[PDB]
Amino acid sequence: SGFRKMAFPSGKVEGCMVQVTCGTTTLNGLWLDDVVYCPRHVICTSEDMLNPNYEDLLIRKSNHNFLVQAGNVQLRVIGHSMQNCVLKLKVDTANPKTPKYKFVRIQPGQTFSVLACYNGSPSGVYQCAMRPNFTIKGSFLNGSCGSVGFNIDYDCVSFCYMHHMELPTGVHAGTDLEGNFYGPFVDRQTAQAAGTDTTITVNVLAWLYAAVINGDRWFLNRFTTTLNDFNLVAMKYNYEPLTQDHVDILGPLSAQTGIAVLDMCASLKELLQNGMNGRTILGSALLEDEFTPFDVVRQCSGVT
Amino acid sequence: SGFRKMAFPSGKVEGCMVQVTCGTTTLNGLWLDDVVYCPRHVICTSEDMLNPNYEDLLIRKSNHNFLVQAGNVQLRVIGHSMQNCVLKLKVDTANPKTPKYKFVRIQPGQTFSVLACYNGSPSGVYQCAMRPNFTIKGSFLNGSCGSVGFNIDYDCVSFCYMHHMELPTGVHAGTDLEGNFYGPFVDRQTAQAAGTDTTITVNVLAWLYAAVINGDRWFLNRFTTTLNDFNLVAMKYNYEPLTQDHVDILGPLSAQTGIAVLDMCASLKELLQNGMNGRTILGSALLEDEFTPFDVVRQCSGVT
Numbered sequence: 125s126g127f128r129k130m131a132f133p134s135g136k137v138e139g140c141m142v143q144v145t146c147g148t149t150t151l152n153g154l155w156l157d158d159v160v161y162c163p164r165h166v167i168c169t170s171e172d173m174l175n176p177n178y179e180d181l182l183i184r185k186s187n188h189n190f191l192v193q194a195g196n197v198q199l200r201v202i203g204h205s206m207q208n209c210v211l212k213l214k215v216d217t218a219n220p221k222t223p224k225y226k227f228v229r230i231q232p233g234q235t236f237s238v239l240a241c242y243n244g245s246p247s248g249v250y251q252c253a254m255r256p257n258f259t260i261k262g263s264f265l266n267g268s269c270g271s272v273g274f275n276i277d278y279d280c281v282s283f284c285y286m287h288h289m290e291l292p293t294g295v296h297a298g299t300d301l302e303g304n305f306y307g308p309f310v311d312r313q314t315a316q317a318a319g320t321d322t323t324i325t326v327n328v329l330a331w332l333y334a335a336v337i338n339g340d341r342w343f344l345n346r347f348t349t350t351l352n353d354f355n356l357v358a359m360k361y362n363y364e365p366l367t368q369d370h371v372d373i374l375g376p377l378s379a380q381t382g383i384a385v386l387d388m389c390a391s392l393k394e395l396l397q398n399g400m401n402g403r404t405i406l407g408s409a410l411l412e413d414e415f416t417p418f419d420v421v422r423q424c425s426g427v428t
Numbered sequence: 429s430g431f432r433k434m435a436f437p438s439g440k441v442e443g444c445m446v447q448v449t450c451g452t453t454t455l456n457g458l459w460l461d462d463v464v465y466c467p468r469h470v471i472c473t474s475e476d477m478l479n480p481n482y483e484d485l486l487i488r489k490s491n492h493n494f495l496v497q498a499g500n501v502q503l504r505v506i507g508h509s510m511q512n513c514v515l516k517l518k519v520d521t522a523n524p525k526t527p528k529y530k531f532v533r534i535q536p537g538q539t540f541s542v543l544a545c546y547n548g549s550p551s552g553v554y555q556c557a558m559r560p561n562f563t564i565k566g567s568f569l570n571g572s573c574g575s576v577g578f579n580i581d582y583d584c585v586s587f588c589y590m591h592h593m594e595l596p597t598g599v600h601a602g603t604d605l606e607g608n609f610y611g612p613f614v615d616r617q618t619a620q621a622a623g624t625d626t627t628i629t630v631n632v633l634a635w636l637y638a639a640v641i642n643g644d645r646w647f648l649n650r651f652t653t654t655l656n657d658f659n660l661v662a663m664k665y666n667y668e669p670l671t672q673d674h675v676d677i678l679g680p681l682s683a684q685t686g687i688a689v690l691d692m693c694a695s696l697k698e699l700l701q702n703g704m705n706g707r708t709i710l711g712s713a714l715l716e717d718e719f720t721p722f723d724v725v726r727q728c729s730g731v732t
């Protein structure tokens with residue numbers, strides 16, 4: 125028993141972290157096979173991050189201007205190209221520590237682990253979610269760019285996120301491993317609108333099932349609701365509308381606990397309308413939405 | 429910016445996880461050099477966990493009864509001994525992946541990362557604290573015994589915890605890497621009293637400094653207090669008494685923010701007496717006490 129915001133073991137990803145230096149800028153790169161992936165804003169001086177012409181800026185750059193260091197050893201760059209907002213540096217040596225990997229573009233509401241890095245060195249691992257407004261509420265400082273978000277399925281690492289920037293609001297924006305930003309964000313130092321961030325309803329419900337599974341049952345009531353009645357409440361509280369797909373995904377948790385999804389929705393509705401009244405659920409005083417139904421099942425069954 | 433419950437990268441510890449089987453029991457072991465460390469309750473059948481005589485139970489066990497597997501390869505056990513509540517299995521092969529390591533016994537209030545494991549395989553990493561009552565609020569299931577708690581300083585892993593049991597209350601108990609339990613707990617299936625769990629005052633204060641450092645300043649007031657006035661409030665709310673050592677440890681955070689420790693204590697006092705009033709601090713609706721002043725400085729400065 126017990127329920128914690130658990131990240132994936134970071135070992136397979138630590139062996140991929142390298143340092144990329146271009147002129148005066150140092151950030152992180154991901155070394156997989158003979159390619160180093162990093163944010164293209166590595167080629168930007170501070171004077172041009174305001175409105176950069178990346179194509180023009182990259183032309184003034186040659187293979188020898190990209191310094192790639194894996195630990196204490198220098199990697200030889202034999203190729204360089206720009207794919208959307210990431211640079212791909214072809215190196216002459218394949219990473220001996222390359223794990224089995226996939227590049228995947230996650231959906232909002234999905235979760236992933238981040239290995240925060242500085243100068244190609246890992247500093248920490250935390251679990252987060254792609255928010256419905258495509259931002260991530262992470263912990264990143266200057267030098268953390270190029271830090272990656274991933275998931276693990278047995279032995280295969282699915283890379284889903286690369287850190288590119290912090291908005292003036294303190295939230296984080298970045299791309300998939302093909303360089304496409306999640307959301308409407310651009311790698312430009314300009315006023316960018318994050319957008320309204322709703323609560324991931326299906327995740328809050330999955331966490332309510334985890335709470336029941338771990339003994340916290342105070343919030344369970346004698347009521348039920350309908351998808352349309354629950355969704356009227358969800359709209360008022362800026363919660364994502366719950367669909368039949370969400371009910372279906374919650375199926376195994378509903379089966380394991382013997383609590384129908386719509387009954388849990390009525391508990392959620394009562395918590396939304398009345399609040400916690402000074403009580404906690406899994407040691408939290410707010411409704412947690414960064415655990416997917418898959419995360420709950422995984423953590424409550426012990427998948428390694 | 430941003431503040432998250434961040435665990436250490438788990439790679440160096442993943443390379444040490446092995447599976448130990450004794451009769452019908454399978455749990456995790458820690459392989460460092462030519463020794464595998466694991467909970468001695470590996471030798472216990474279910475019928476004898478109620479009141480085991482470990483010395484007598486171990487006598488009926490030989491080196492060949494301890495099955496140690498590192499991934500898919502079997503390790504040859506050439507020695508076995510009991511040190512307090514851990515068994516030390518001497519194997520004929522040193523772990524090629526042994527990192528630089530220390531065995532340390534942490535203080536209550538200190539934090540550490542846990543690599544939850546099942547069958548010698550890592551499943552997740554989370555950050556937790558040794559509670560003032562010597563328990564840990566972790567996430568552990570059957571098979572997780574032998575999972576370790578550690579800290580990292582540059583390249584040296586300081587092992588501080590080994591998971592042994594869950595109390596009927598849902599909290600977790602375990603030992604240091606010499607087999608001595610943290611707290612009054614025994615590796616026996618009996619009714620054990622966890623004890624009153626107070627809040628780690630110095631950690632809540634460190635987290636209030638992290639909140640200010642990251643923009644959350646609503647809780648700052650026009651008041652101050654004294655150590656004795658603050659401690660009268662701390663006692664009422666089951667908070668650890670704040671000492672001059674705690675004030676001294678908070679020094680660098682006080683210097684960085686320009687907010688005197690006693691002024692922050694008055695903010696804490698007002699939050700304790702009045703509550704959050706529906707507001708949040710670093711995305712939390714309660715006062716967080718599982719970040720030490722060292723964790724706050726580390727995460728706010730980017731130490732790798």
Ligand SMILES: Cc1ccncc1NC(=O)[C@@H](C)c1cc(Cl)cc(O[C@@H]2CC(=O)N2)c1
Nearest residue numbers: 264265266289290291292311312313314316
């Ligand atoms: C300094 C910092 C702290 C933590 N993590 C990453 C960072 N990154 C940043 O804030 C920096 C270097 C940056 C890069 C890019 Cl590609 C775009 C930028 O514009 C921001 C987005 C917005 O709105 N204004 C800013």
Ligand SMILES: Cc1ccncc1NC(=O)[C@@H](C)c1cc(Cl)cc(O[C@@H]2CC(=O)N2)c1
Nearest residue numbers: 568569570593594595596615616617618620
């Ligand atoms: C089943 C489980 C779940 C998660 N993590 C570890 C576990 N462990 C346990 O609860 C088991 C196997 C256990 C071992 C030991 Cl050494 C002592 C025990 O007594 C408990 C302590 C108390 O009070 N009663 C119990």
